[PDB]
Amino acid sequence: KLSEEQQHIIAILLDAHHKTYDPTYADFRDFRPPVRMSPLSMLPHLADLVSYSIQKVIGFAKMIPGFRDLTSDDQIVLLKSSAIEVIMLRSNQSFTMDDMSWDCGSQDYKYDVTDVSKAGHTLELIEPLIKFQVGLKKLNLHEEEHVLLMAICIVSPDRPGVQDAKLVEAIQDRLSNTLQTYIRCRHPPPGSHQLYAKMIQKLADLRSLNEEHSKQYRSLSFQPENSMKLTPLVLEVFGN
């Protein structure tokens, strides 16, 4: 019982994802190369990767139905607070549970816990990050549910600094109703409710992952020798 508006929304989000996610990872060749050999040897490569993904998340967010009906300040607030979470979400497409790594094409662009360690982060973040990727992968989401979850995570009225929270909620409500209805067409109860509840829990997990990444990013970026290796976009989005 997907309405034609709900079918329209899913078609829009699927296309937006296909225009902002490159499964070939061809643009990785333009990043500063990874050094693995202590110095934060993977910070330059991973900073470029994160910077590249921030751009993709902005491109995806712009195509969410209703997002551009918000003020520019609310668009900025929603993107600044959600960029880290959407990166963790969209990274799950490359995550594989064979060796707990993000496989993006080749061994050069295959990242494990030690590579994240090589960017300055500790297990306080990486251990919660890995169990998130595993639990998300075990859901075996359809691409429809995946792109809906990313959009819902962006248009969240539960963000500090939001001005028109009621408008943000109304936009999220139709994405949420679209996701709930899509699940019901593919899963009878109670499995239908067990899936949507686990997806909302993943959004809750991202909030604590958001908090821990910002704590470690603040300690890392406070050192000028580290922030020198970042990009201007990362400094703007992750800093102010």
């Binding site: 751009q55 902005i58 491109g59 712009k62 520019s72 668009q75 900025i76 993107l79 600044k80 201007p232 976009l233 703007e236 989005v237 102010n240």
Partner: peptide
């Protein structure tokens, strides 16, 4: 507290 790069990408 100003985001000229995000604004440019949002435009």
């Amino acid at each position: 507290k100003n985001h000229p790069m995000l604004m440019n990408l949002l435009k």
